[PDB]
Structures are given as C-alpha cells and as structure tokens.
Subunit: 223 residues, 5 copies
C-alpha cells in the first residue's frame, strides 16, 4: 500500500570532448530510460530535470508501491549513466499521505498530474529533542507551520510532498516540491523561517533545484 520514491542526480564526467556521435548516443540513452519507466504500470511517475547546480547535470524523480521496482529502476538508471557520468545524490523514502488524506485528496492523483516547471528536493532531519516532546506540543508547533504556509500569497500552485526515510537513509525526511516560480517559492521558504518548527530542523543539504525537461530534449540542453 505505501508509495516509495527516489530522487537521483548525476553529473557527466569531465575531461572528455563530446562528438556529435556522443550527443546522439546520450539522446538515445535518455529516451530509452524514459521508455523503461513508461513501459511498467508499476511506476506511478517518472520525471527528468535539468539542474541549476553545477554538481549535477540531470535529476531523476520516480515513484512506485513496489520496492522491487524501486531497486530495478535505480540499477537501470545507474547502468545507463555509469559509462558517462557519476551520481551526485540519491535518496529512497516513503510518502507521508496523511496531509493529502486530511484534505480528501489522493497523493497518487497528485503524482499523476502533469508536472510543474520546477522541482525542489532536499533531505531534512530534526534534533533528537523534537521526538521527545509530547505528541500534543509537536502537533501545535506543526499546526503553526502548516497554517503559516497555507496563508502565504506566494504559496499558490505549489505541490508539496513529505516523505520519510527513518532507518533507511542518511536523513529522516526527504521533502519534495513541484513549483511554478523559483522566486515565489524562495519567498515562501523565507517567511517560514518565522515558524517555531525551525528551532528543531537541521541538515537541509543538498537542496536540488530542477527545471522540467523531456527525455528527447535533454542531450541538446546538456551538450
């Protein structure tokens, strides 16, 4: 029943000049990755992003209820990327659907919508003291944050996903956002620095910022 997700980033190896043949080879490879995901109904979503950071050229995001499909997908992407690139980040985590369920929405339905132009992903953790607080006081601290986010004008049109990775990765959470406007998102985040929740929040690096790209267009953008 639970939905797993991964975010992977890769950087093309330096020290090599790329021929036209190399460009075409990259294009065929990205199209093939895209076809791998489209061919299996078990993949709920798969999107590719160009990267604003120089430590990555491409970011991949995909989701499935099947943990076997999750490892197969990682190996597929890795096998395709390794002759020309190295991974700069990976995460595996599980969507928390409760914010969607609370609003009579299905998280999966959101994942099936055509993606927004930008994507933000980062790991996040909280200090040990956070979990040692009463469920009630944590609820209050979190309500303030949620209320504050909901009330921001620049919040309009953002799709937010909280995912958990306790016991299975180097962070407790991986938080994912589909966003229409980089500056607007930054302003929302800046306002949310005003929430008490911040006092317990740590380790939000790397923050990945991506620009949606079709598989057939990426080689042309990169090379």
């Amino acid at each position: 029943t639970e939905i797993y997700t991964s975010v992977l980033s890769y950087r093309l190896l330096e020290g090599k000049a790329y021929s036209d043949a190399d460009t075409r080879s990259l294009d065929r490879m990205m199209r093939s990755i895209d076809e791998f995901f489209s061919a299996n109904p078990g993949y709920i979503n798969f999107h590719i992003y160009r990267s604003y950071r120089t430590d990555s050229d491409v970011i991949f995001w995909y989701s499935s209820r099947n943990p076997d499909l999750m490892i197969l997908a990682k190996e597929r992407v890795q096998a395709s990327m390794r002759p020309i690139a190295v991974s700069s980040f990976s995460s595996i985590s599980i969507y928390d659907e409760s914010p969607y369920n609370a609003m009579n929405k299905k998280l999966e339905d959101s994942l099936r919508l055509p993606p927004l132009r930008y994507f933000v992903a980062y790991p996040m953790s909280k200090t040990p003291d956070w979990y040692l607080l009463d469920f009630d006081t944590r609820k209050e601290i979190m309500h303030e944050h949620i209320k504050m986010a909901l009330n921001h004008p620049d919040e309009k049109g953002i799709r937010s996903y909280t995912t958990y990775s306790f016991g299975i990765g180097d962070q407790e959470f991986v938080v994912l956002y589909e966003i229409p406007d980089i500056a607007a998102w930054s302003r929302v985040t800046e306002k949310l620095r005003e929430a008490r929740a911040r006092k317990w929040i740590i380790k939000e690096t790397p923050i990945l910022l991506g620009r949606l790209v079709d598989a057939g267009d990426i080689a042309g953008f990169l090379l």
Copy 2:
C-alpha cells in the same frame, strides 16, 4: 568465543562501457567470491545485496569467529573488486536461539547496516540505569505492530573502527521497518544516540544473478 562481522560496499567505476565479455567476467568473479566463502565453513555467513544508494552497487556481509579469516576475506573481496570498483564503506565489529544459529538461518529479503555511536555522558550512567533504558527501547520495538519478522544484531567496534556500534538488520518490509524506527525516536535511549553515516539499505541477491542486475 567471539564472532566478528564485516560489511563492505563497492561502487563500479564510471567512465567505462561494459561489453558482453565484461558481463560474463563479472558473473564469474561474483560466483568466485561466493565460492571463496562457501569453501571455508569458518565463514558462519556470507550474503550479497544490491544497493539502493547510488554510491554503491553491491554490499557484502560475512561473519567468522576467526580474525585471520576476517582479514583474508577483506583482502579477497578487495583483490577481486579493485580492477573494476572502489570501496565506499567498510566495518569490522564484534557481535554483542543462539546468535550463531540465527546467522545460519536463510536471509531475509532486505538488509540495513549502519554505524552508530553514543555521547560520552551515556557510558558514565550507572549500568542498571543503562540496562533499564535499553530494555524500554527493546520493549517499545517488540510492541510495535510493524516489528514482526525483523532480525537485529547489535555489534560493537570500540577502539577498532570509526563508530562504536554497527547495528545490522534483516527485514521483510522496508516501509514497516521505517515506521518502527520512527516510533523508536520516542525512546529515552535516543537522547544519547549519535546517528552516524552511512545507512546502507540492500536487497538480497544470489551471486549468479548480480551481473544481470548491475549491467
């Protein structure tokens, strides 16, 4: 009487395309490592895992009472892997239904390894106090509806590695284990626990199947 254990992870080197002959060579090499371990009953266990993390392609886990076998194993695996791969992690530690019998059971589908340490203040607490704290934590785990079927081994590495403990888990269900872990954040024991890196998550694989998965 002590039983040692090691977890090693490796990443295949980038920048090279693998031919069909390279794929066969990898298959032979992986099967050769597997048979290295099976040929010596001194190795209580040996398992290979596919890696969820992109910083590794394979994880190895093996155990022996014989510290000589532990260094021979590390050298064997490294000698086999170095032409095509680099290690991304290693640990050597000592384990804390006999544990040996448990290690001989058929392995579960998933595996988690991670280093961990505790704050200096922890060890300065009374043994009875620490025992009580550790028992609440065990009890909290045992009572969680998602804990069913998880096997855990706490191993120690004081003075012999870069963490104080390496805790190893065989788990049937990744999401279930993550939920148990989340609940355990509420245990008193967590106050003194220093998360260390990396947390490794693996999918059990037969040596004969790994070249097909990787390449």
Copy 3:
C-alpha cells in the same frame, strides 16, 4: 520583477600538458562564452575572474531577470568547461533590492557600472533564533552592522549585494562584493566582527576571491 544571479567556479583538470593548440582552444572557448552573454541583453551582467584559491582557476558571475536564461547560462558554461575542467562551486540566488531602494537607488543600475578589480563571494546563513527575533530587533542589529561598515576608513568604493537563496540552495544568502582593495576589505570585515549581528551568522565557506579579467586575456594568465 526579481533579479537572479549565479556564481560558478571551475578548476582546470590536472595531469595534462597544454599545447599551444590547447592554449588557443581555451582562449577561443572563453571568448565564445563571453559573446554568448554579450549577445543577449537579457543578461544584465557577466564578469570573469582569476581565482586566488588553488581549488579554482576561474570564477564566473552573471545576472538576469529570466530564470530560463539562468539555466541556459549554467548549461552553456558547464558544456564549455567540462572537456577541460570541473566545477568547484555554484550558487543560484535572488538580489535583495531594498537596501538600494532605502537609499533611493536602483540595483540594476549598479550591476551595469564598470566592474571593480576584485570580487568576493561566499555563502552565509543565520541561526534559527535570528528569524524568530522581532522585525524591529533585526532592523536595529542590521542598522548597527550597516553603519559600522559605512563609517570604516577602509570601506571606500566597496559595492555589496545581499542575495537570498532560501529553499533553493545549500545556504540562505550569497553575499557578493566588488572591492577596489583586498586588504582594505579584510580590515573592514575584521571590524565588523564586533557587530552584534555576528552572534547569529554561520557557514561563510567557501569564500571566493577573484581578480577581474577580460575573456580574451584569461588563457594567457592561466597557461
């Protein structure tokens, strides 16, 4: 409305002697990058710097209102550098225009002034406690800081830009400075260690220090 900015740094790969041909190639490539930025009026500024740090050989700094131009610029620079170099830093952030508005002046005008000889950039963040202080408390603390800078004997000629990157990079701010004199700036910074503001400031690494260079002159300096 918002103006975006990026600072990128690259290190030439080691282990190869550069021929005369390789020198010509680097000169041509740098000239071509520069023509890329000059040809598009959508790029408000673009400057190249030689690097005092050994972990870089070149620093690029450019600005645009257009985030599409920003991702295209990053991809263009990365595609040009990757056969011979690896990136050692990148940032994407948004100018804060209010300090300029407070002195009745436009930030864009300033970005159009002839560049000064030296350049400093670094990331910076603040402790969670900072954002939880009242808005008027932060104004008082920041006033002390800004005034202390303005009255320093060594402050002459310095142009500073505070840029923000909440939710879009690994730091909260990227602070950029054009300076006429390195030691003068260092003395100003040393005095500002006495400002109350320092209590809440963290993570000022890496600090990049650059010497202004024209695209057609850098090959000569690097090789």
Copy 4:
C-alpha cells in the same frame, strides 16, 4: 636520550587496473626494497608493515627514529615507491611520551612486534587544558587505574605520542595488541572513565595485522 619521533602511513592500491603476475612480482620487489631501506639504517629504531582491516587502506607502515631528518627521508622514500601504484590514505608525525615506561620505551620498540596494531589520532577539548593540573592528574589517574585493572589489558603495549603544533591532531595513540576483541572490550570499559568527557576526534582508527615485507604481495594481489 633525545626525543623519539614516529610516523604511521597508510596506502591504498589504485583501482581500475588488473594486476598481472609481473605487477605482483614488482610489488614484492618494491616492498622488500622498502624493508631493506629501513633495516640498513640503524637510525630507524623500528619499522613494521601491516595488512589493513579497512578497505580504504591496503597497507599500513609504522616507523620510529630520534632523527627528524630520517623521518622526512622515510616518508619521501615510501611515497616515491608507492605513488606509481597507490595513494596515501593517512599520515602522521608525532613524538613518544616516554613517562609511562620510565623500563625504556626504546626497548619496547625493539621487541618483536605483536600480531595486531591499532593507531588513531586523538584530541581534547580546549576546556581540558584549562582545568587545574591537579584535576587533570586525578582524571588521568582514574583512566590509567581502570585500564590496569581490566583482565583483557594483558599483554597490550601502549604508546601515547604527541603532535601539538605539528599535525592535525594533538595525540596519536598506538597499540600493539595480541587480540582484537580483547582490545575492543578494554576500550569499551574505558568509556566509563571521566577522561572521555573531553576526548574528541578519534578517526580514522587504523587496525592492522602484522606482515612480513616478502609476504604482503601474496596477501594483497
């Protein structure tokens, strides 16, 4: 009677190349040649080679001399021999604290080495040095007594060395040990000493298995 310096260096064979039998013979010749280099100069008090339990090293070297010129010459020789095939994963230079032996520490260094070796850097918090000398003395005496009284301390040879101002750590502590698990149990017990409150930065911990120069190529390749 002047100070005795020591260095621990570790190296990892470069990945991405298959080693031929000729490569194996070359490594054997090189290791034997390094061992001869240390043996030929009586200024080197000891020199031992260790196989490494960690994957980030294949070999660990330990050597000592009163002559700091011989120390840098040793590091340069080892690096020159290793660099065509390996990268260094750790190095240290430090000076033995002879007070616990004061027996002669040099006599201990000249004994045949034990089967295992542990080395690691260590530092203390700034606050430690600011404590009254009596308080530091009382804390160190507690630690030493707790170590002396542990059954598993049997037959371990310990060396504390200092590197204030000359390296990235304050101390490099070195142990010759007969048994890995016994050492780990001693170390575990010693977490109960108050000394621990001020100790930081004990990474990497290097754990080695003694090896003859003529046997290492066979073990590694």
Copy 5:
C-alpha cells in the same frame, strides 16, 4: 602599505611511474619557479619546503605588498604544477605588523632574514563570542598569551578566505616547538580558538634539490 602572503601545497599525481626524463623535467620546473620569484623584487620572500604529510609533496611560501603579483604568483605555480600535481591547500592573508611595530622592528626585515630549517602554517579562527568581548578584556587575555630562535607571524584573512587567521612560524626544532605549543594550551586565549586544520609542517629545501628528494 600592507604585506600579503600565501602558502600553497601540492601533491604529485599518483598512478605514474616517473622516468629519468620526468625527474629532470621536475628539476627544471622547480628551478624555473625559483627563478621567477628571484627575478622580481616585488616578492619580499619565496621559500620551498618538503612536507611531512603525505597529502603534500611540496609547500610554497611567498609574500608581496602587491595583490596583482600575488595572483600572478599563484597562477605561475599552479600552471607549472598542473600537468603533474594537484593543490592540497592554499591560503591568502595579510601580515599583522603590530607585534613587530611594538618592539620597534620591521616585519619586512624579518621576512628577508635567511629562513630557518622548519616552517609551520595553519588556519585558525575564533568563536563569535570572542570579538564581542570588551576591547579591554581581549587585550588582557592576549597579553597573557603573548607573554606566555622561533620566528612568529600572525596573518589575517577576514572576509577573503575560509579562516580568520593563518599563523606562520619558522622554527629550528620540531620537538621543542611541539612542547611550546602544548604549554600554550594553558593560555586563557585557547577558550575561543577553533579550526586549526590542516597544520602544515615543512622542511626547507633549495629548488635545485627538491626533485632528488621527491623522486
């Protein structure tokens, strides 16, 4: 009239067997770097050092009042080193001439003295809390430390590097120096001192001799 200084360290690339041709080439290149510095009186000093640390083979130290000569020197060294080596550290900082001015001496005169056998450099910073102490309190604490052969240089790099200070020493004896540093751990000043890494320790070498030592 400030004086800038840089410390650069480099490590020869591994994976290459150096021929005799390569040794001669290294020798020519080192002598050529030395000739570059000697030929320009704008450089107040320039010295090369062998390194105790395996992460460096060579350390360079030079000084100039002219910041455009400083970037020229770094690029010159980097251009020569690039085909065979990678830099493991660099700093750029400015001498604090006040201790020399307090004793009515000139820092520059001291930089022109024949160098001592050993060189120590490391970055250092202080906690924020330090600078916010009353000017009075700071001067008192510093007087205990200052009061508590060796040639010392404090250099500052506020706002221009990853550390606040780079402290440089020419020393005649390593062990004696380690003992001085241990004693100074007792100075009140240490409360607020952080981040002294890497500590580089160098042995003075002539340009003409370095190739023979390294290869």
